[PDB]
Design goal:
- Chain A: Belongs to the type II (or gamma) interferon family.
- Chain A: One of its GO terms (biological process) is positive regulation of inflammatory response.
- Two copies of one chain form a homodimer.
- Chain A has helices at 2-15, 30-35, 43-58, 67-81, 86-96, 103-111, 113-120.
- By secondary structure, chain A is mainly alpha-helical.
- The interface between A and B is large, with 71 and 75 residues.
């Protein structure tokens, strides 16, 4: 709560994210978060939002100034969204990192479509 | 028709090849891990967005274009309950780049709201 606020401020500082030039261009996630506030299937949307932050942080991994801020925020997302389950986290990380432009991966995906479709229905 | 369509896609990509076995399964293991998980939509969300992104990346193979359209439409009906508002939101989220500074600032600026929603 106090370590978490400090960290978000640290990131806002680094990016210069508390300035008015930011609101310029419409919301990113805030509107969608309202649309699904009370939806029983909101995890569908939260999953995309959380994966976005993981990917963002992953690719800002070498900025020493914000490294720990990202580690703290990530750990928190992990606890709240993935119930601190380390097996769930490994799965989540594997899925978000899959490329769509790799042929070997495209074949596997097509190859597993029957199983995917059954899980959805 | 989607079943016959998956087989069409499997035929095109020559999915029965032993090459495809290399490196293990992509989603099948994960699907098992979460079969009875009350929060499985977290994982299905990532699997469905992968297919949606893949189908856009394959829009150049004209012969399989209708198979992909049929499969995609079916995922839309079953996973997003055919809700067109949900589809617009989902599509918007899966297309967000992580290398655009303007978007990064927006995301950092909305982090408190995101974190509150994860409650």
């Amino acid at each position: 709560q106090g370590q978490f606020f400090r960290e978000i401020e640290n990131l806002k500082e680094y990016f210069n994210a508390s300035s008015p030039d930011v609101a310029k261009g419409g919301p990113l996630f805030s509107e969608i978060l309202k649309n699904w506030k009370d939806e029983s299937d909101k995890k569908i949307i939260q999953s995309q939002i959380v994966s976005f932050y993981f990917k963002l942080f992953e690719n800002l991994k070498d900025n020493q100034v914000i490294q720990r801020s990202m580690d703290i925020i990530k750990q928190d997302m992990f606890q709240k969204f993935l119930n601190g389950s380390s097996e769930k986290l490994e799965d989540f990380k594997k899925l978000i990192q899959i490329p769509v432009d790799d042929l070997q991966i495209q074949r596997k995906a097509i190859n597993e479509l029957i199983k995917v479709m059954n899980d959805l229905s």
